Every structure is written in C-alpha cells, then in structure tokens.
Design a protein around this ligand. Sequence first.
Ligand SMILES: Nc1ncnc2c1ncn2[C@@H]1O[C@H](COP(=O)(O)OP(=O)(O)OP(=O)(O)O)[C@@H](O)[C@H]1O
Lengths: 95, 843
Amino acid sequence: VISTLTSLHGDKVVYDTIQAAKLYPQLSELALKLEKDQIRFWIATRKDPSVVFEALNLNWAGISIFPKPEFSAWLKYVDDVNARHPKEAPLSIIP
Amino acid sequence: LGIQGEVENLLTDLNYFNAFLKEAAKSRRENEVLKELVKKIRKVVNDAEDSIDKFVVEAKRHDDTHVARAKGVADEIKSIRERVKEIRDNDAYGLQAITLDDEERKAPVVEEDDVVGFDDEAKTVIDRLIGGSDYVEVVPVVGMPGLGKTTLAYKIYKDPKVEYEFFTRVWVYVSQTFKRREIFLNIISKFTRNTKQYDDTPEDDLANEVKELLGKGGKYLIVLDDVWTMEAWDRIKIAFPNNGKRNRVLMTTRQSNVAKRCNDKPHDLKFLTKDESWELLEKKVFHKEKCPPELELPGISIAEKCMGLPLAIVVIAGALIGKGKTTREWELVAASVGEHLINRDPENCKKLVQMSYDRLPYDLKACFLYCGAFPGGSQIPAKKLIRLWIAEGFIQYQGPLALEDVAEDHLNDLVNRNLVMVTQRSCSGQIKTCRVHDMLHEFCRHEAMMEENLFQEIKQGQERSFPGKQELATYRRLCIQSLIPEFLSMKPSGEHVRSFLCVGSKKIDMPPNEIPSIPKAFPLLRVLDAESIKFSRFSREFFKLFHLRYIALSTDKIKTIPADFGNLWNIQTLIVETQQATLDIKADIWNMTRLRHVCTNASATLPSTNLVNRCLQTLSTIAPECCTAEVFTRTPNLKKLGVRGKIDALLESSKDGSGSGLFSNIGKLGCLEYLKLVNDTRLSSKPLHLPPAYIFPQKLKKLSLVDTWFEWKDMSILGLLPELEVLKLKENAFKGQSWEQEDGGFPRLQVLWIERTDLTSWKASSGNFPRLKHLALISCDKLEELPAELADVKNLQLIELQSSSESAARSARAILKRNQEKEQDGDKGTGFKLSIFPHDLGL
Ligand SMILES: Nc1ncnc2c1ncn2[C@@H]1O[C@H](COP(=O)(O)OP(=O)(O)OP(=O)(O)O)[C@@H](O)[C@H]1O
C-alpha cells in the first residue's frame, strides 16, 4: 500500500523475484497476489509496451514466441490497457 | 561506499550478459564471429565473477594492508567495467545478432549388410515384439549415441521373421525437430499415392486417416526412429490404432526417461566385444580380404581403443583407409584414436554427440563436461562427483529441495540421456560409480578445453609442456593425472584458477617443500580435489584460500586439523582420508553456514558451539563425547551420522537418577536417514546391549555397525524400526554363539550384510524378512547352517556366501533347492545366483 514497497526502483527484478518466491508453498499465495498487484501498477501509469515486453523476458525467442504463455499474457496486458486508456490514442504491440 | 555502487552496476550488466550466454547456448553458433563474440563475453563474465569474488571476500575480511587491497579491488572493478562498456559500445551490433537468430531431412544411413554381432540382440527384440498384450505395446531400444540402435532397428525391420509376422511395417524418422503433419502424410503415402486430396485436411483428421490405414492392415510394426521426447510420442501415437491385434512399436531412442515411460522395462543395446570390434574394423578397412599379418597387431589395438562402439570403429576405419597399409601409419592412428574420432571427423562423431549435448539444460552442460576432467576409462565415485558439481557452482537451484537431491537428479538425468554410464548401483537403487564412454569422454575434453574452456589438462607430452604464465592467465580450472610435484616445483602463477583437480589414481607422497605451492599459486582456489596427493603438514598459505568450497586430502602424520581452518567460511565439503585413529577438528566449523559434509576417517572431537546449520547433511565419524544436546540443535536437517570411538560412554547411564544416555539425543533427530557405529574397545570382554526402540531415530533408513560386540538377543529391538531398509554388520559386529529371532520385525528391510559373524547357529521365523532382497555372509566360517524360514521370502533376489563351512554349504544347497522348487511351482525367478566351488562336492 505504501509507495515505497510498490515502486521498488524497478519492475523486471521485482517480477523475477515474484516468480522465484512462487516455488515455495509458504510463499505461493503471497507471490500470486503480489503478481496481480504488479499488473495494477502496469495499468495505473500505462507504461510503454517495450518495458513490459522486456519485463516478461520475451526478448530471446524466434518462432517460439507464440506458443510461450508469456506472449499470451503480454497480449492480455495490451488489451487491458486498451480498456483503461486515458485517451483514445491507440496502443499497439506492433511497434 | 562508491565501490559498492560500482559492483552493483557491474552486477546488473552481467545479469544481461549471463542471460545472453544462456540463450546463446540454446543452439550451435556456426558463424566464426559469433563464436568469438560468445567467447569474449564469456571471458569477461568469468573474469568479472573472479573480481566480484575478490571484492565480496575482501569485504568479509574487512568486517573482522587493507587500504592497498581495497585500492587494488577498486582498480580491478574499474577495468572490467570499462571492458564491459567497450563490449556494449563497439560490439553492440554483435549482441543483437545472436539475439536475432532463428533444411533437409538427414535420415541416418546404416549397414544394410555385414551387421557384426547383432544376431542375438535382433532375436531378443524380435521375440519381444511377438509376445505381449493384444493392445499397443512399445519396445524401446535405448543406448548411447552411435551404439547401433538404427542398425538393429533396420536389422529387425528387414528380418525375414518380422517381414512374415507383420503385414504392415512403417519406418518413421522422428527427431529433435519434426512436423507432426508431414509424418502422417509420410505414413499415408505408403498406402495411397494421392497426396493432393489432403492439402487442407487438419492434422488430427490426418491422424484419423492414418488410424484407418494401419487398422485394416492387421498386426503392424512401426519403427519410431530417434524419438527424443515423451511429448513427441503423445503427439504421434494418436494415429496408432489400438485394434487389439498385437501391433507393436519399436522405438529407438537415446533417452531412458522416454523409454521407461513408454515401457516399464526398456531394452538397452549392447556394446561390441573386443573380438567383434576387430572383426568389424577388418571388414570395413579391407574389402572381403584378410588383414596382412603386419597390420593385425596395430589394428587389434585400435579396435580395443574404440571401446566396442560401432560408430568409433566406422570412423577410425575411414582414417585407416586413407593412411595406407603401412605398420608405421597404423601405429600413429592407434596412438591417436580419440583425435581421429572427434577432431579429424567432426561430421561423424562430433556432430552426433552435439545433438544430445546441445539439448541439455544450461546447468547440465557444465555438469556433463565436468565428467571429462577425470581420466579416460576411469570410474568416478558418484558421491564425490555430486559434491564437485555443487561446490564448483553448477547446481543453481532455489527450491526447497536439498542441493544433493537436485544434483542426484542431474546425474540421473545424464544417465537417462545415456551421456553417462553407471557401473555400480547400490542395493537401494542409488548411483555408486559412473564412467563416461571413451567417445563421449573425448567430446567432453575437446568441448571443455577449446570451446568452453571449463578445464585444462596439464601433462608433459612430446609436443606439450607445462603451461607458461601466458597460458595460465587464461586457464579457469586445472586437471592433472601425473607429474604433479614437478609442475608445482616450477612455481606457477594461476591467478584465475578456480579449481585444482588431481584426478590421478595413484597416491603421490609430495615433498613437504611443495606443500604451499597449491594454495600460493592459486589464490582463488574454490575446489581442491587433492584426494590422491598425500599431505604431511599444513601451512598458513593453505588456510588463505578464502574462496574455497571443496577440500579433499589424505594424511598420515596430520593428527589434528588446526583452528586456522575456521577462516574459510565458504567451504561445503571436508574430506580427510586419514590413516590415524584419532583426529581433532580445532576449527569452529559450526559458523560455516553452507557447510554440508564432514567425511572424516577418525573420531572427530568437534569443539563446543540462535543459529542453525540448515545445510549440514553428513558426518562420517564423530566422537561420542561430542554428542551434546547443543550439537543436534544446530543440525535438524542432517541426514547421516557416524560414530567411531568408545561406545561405552554412549550407553552408560549415571546413578544420579538420569536413565537417558547420549543415544537419546541421536533418536531425537527428526530427519536422520543413515547411522553408522564403530567401536574401539577390544581389551574388555563385555558383550554390549542395545537401547530400546522408542529412543531410536524415527526416520532411520540405513545402519552399519562394526566391531561393537552387541548381543544377538537385543536386535529384536532393532526390528522395531519401521523404516529400516539397509543394515550392515562388519568385523564381528555381534557376539554370541546362538541366534534366535522373535516374531515380526524388519517391516521394510531390504539388504543385510554380515562379515566375520560370531554366531554358530541361527533360527528365524517367516515374519522376520517380508521384503528382504539381498543377504551377504562373507567370511562366516563359524556358521553351521541357515534357518529354512529364509526360503519363505517372496521378494528375495540374492544370497551370497564366502568362505563358509562344509555344513553351511549343505544348508545353502538345501535353501537353493527349496527356492528352486518354489520358483518351479509357478513363481518366475528373480535372477538367483550362488557361489559354490567345487560344484561336484555335496551333489
Ligand atoms: N553392428 C554394426 N555393424 C556395423 N556397423 C554398425 C553396427 N552398428 C552400428 N554401425 C555403424 O555405426 C554408425 C552409427 O550407428 P547407428 O546409425 O545405428 O547409430 P545409432 O545408435 O542409431 O545413433 P543415433 O542416436 O546417433 O541415431 C553407422 O555408420 C552404422 O553403420
């Protein structure tokens, strides 16, 4: 709730930390809810799709991008911000 | 400090570089510029890691010449940071090139004729294809690369028995990469030639069409050549009909995990014998003609060095043909058989091995190549190998599993992929010793020397000498089989050496003046595998290895480890194969958080200890007087003790009202799984007693008692252990003339080992060994006869006797006769064998 524990001076390292905490049974529920809260930050400020693309680490894949579930969530992200955009200017994954 | 910031920004850069290297290793890079770019980035990644390690250790030293050392560290971190920015500025296009990476179906070609030594193997698999259930059954042929799996599969595929039995025979070349659609189209093209009508049919509808074609063709056999994954098998098997017509699938593969998941008992292919290797090599080199007598002597040696692998024989045969028919030239090939396999013929041997190697996860590749550091043809202790991977840093795992459990899964993964061969498996099923085949061993050497630079062999060859300081400035790790004292004599300077692996099999008594050479030449020494080297004394340089993780040494004169050892906070494994009976660890090793093993060979008198050693797992030998309550408080996750010394103090109870001895502390460990006891008292005549089972460890699995002289009466208490599986008794571990067992006991016992027993008679009941598999009676000359209740064990597999008496031999024959009668009554045999010599006595 406090902005100190939400900005965290970065997003990619936080995302990797959340995934790392997910393998522990005592941290599975905490990491899962924190993962959703990271999407909350992604929607609140409407960061560029380049940052989220790097945060999901889709930058190393050839023909294998589409089968990757990270690509599906990357598509769901742009759809969500296209339902919460402050102005009607389109946001696209293509650039 | 600003230095702390500099290391932080450097760390983020290596986070990108390591991620770049991991994704760069996902496939082979053939472009020479990309190869050098990967080598440059890997070199700066390693060198930066060597410098951050200097920073973090020197920071630890500073917490407890410091200005000069800090200045040198900051100067270094400045240089690698400049070098990293140099790569990011000048090589910026290159880093994108590997990131932006993305054909012909090379079906293997095999001997249609002159298949040497596969007659018995073909009939074994063919008869296995005939039998089985009416449903779909898989018969996977599994083995190491180039073993002859496709050759045997094609031998069966064209065998007259198979061609008569199976009306439909299909060969499908599955591989690492394949199109699920093209396979069903290929199978359809066997029956109907009209391919235009299936241009838009969906894949699953094509599989439905394949189902109709195979089903009408009666009983069918399908050779799924080189299936690499279970996911591929599930994708393809949807088109194989289960008509109940005894149709089979013959699935050659390099994977044992895939083989086992398709059939519970996969068929492992054999190696050619020494006679068959020469017969094949002679056939390949000479076209239907015998070898000249002058070339027979070197040719046989070459075939022996191929280690029975048909791929190596075929490759070396091509070299021999080019090398003429001269004794001198055939002698040169024999002296360099391994070179002619990997280096001179990369298309045949190097490329085939690369298919399995490049498919490994990035962590497994460093583990597999590390097996090539040990001498070719040697056998590597599995326990030693596991601790080497973890101490070096190849096991990077952040789950709740212990590291050795993960590494054991990695080693079993290599064995499953048939990159490693197991020589000995314990009765519990774990791996004991493993070896790498000679072809894969040359691949491990070449890959980890020239491409990856994981380790370097040091030897005094004809064209090679001990490396100079120009070569040592590049070497990451060193492995050495012989001539160690002279290499340490010339005073090398291995600044970047992280490991010193004395893989020699012969004990070397190094002179005392070369002892400080190892720690002074390699200040960054993480792993010191000096098991073969004998050290008579220590030095202050030996305890300056603050980056040390692994330390193994053999001593005869070193009776006590000095307290200076406690400065090495990063050590995990301690090994001391001391020949002395006593050894005192003066170091306060309890504060080393990542301490995992203490494999002492004598009674270790550990010093007196809010902190928990969550990682410590093993203690090979400990003093009974050191079994304090505080010791076991710090080791809750531990999984093995060993207690050598005067066991009288362990069992003696004081008269002050306290009836609980030090064994009560042993039984309070909630995660113990192995216990070993050795007793030193021999002048006394007292036979000893065993404490009740309600103070025994709850989860104990394995036991080993030596020379304790327990009475035979009190092991009915040992039968109250619910999870006991392994029990070993050696050097007259029990005393008494008579052995009698009470009802029940040993609910899960699997193996019982006895050596030099004191008993003369043994009586048992049927309920004593419900799940016994192996019984060993070595040097039991006092045995009169065995009880007949041992024949009631349905799970029994093996009983072995050595140096038994004549009456004991008669009881062994009687038990064998009863076991044979029961097996002939309808219960299929489990593979019993018995050692009897001579066989004509007592028949
Ligand atoms: N029994 C044999 N007699 C003669 N040559 C053999 C024999 N077995 C295999 N070979 C030869 O060894 C080479 C490799 O054998 P094969 O093609 O059967 O490999 P494999 O075990 O299927 O391996 P991979 O996993 O790489 O496909 C071939 O050139 C083949 O001719």
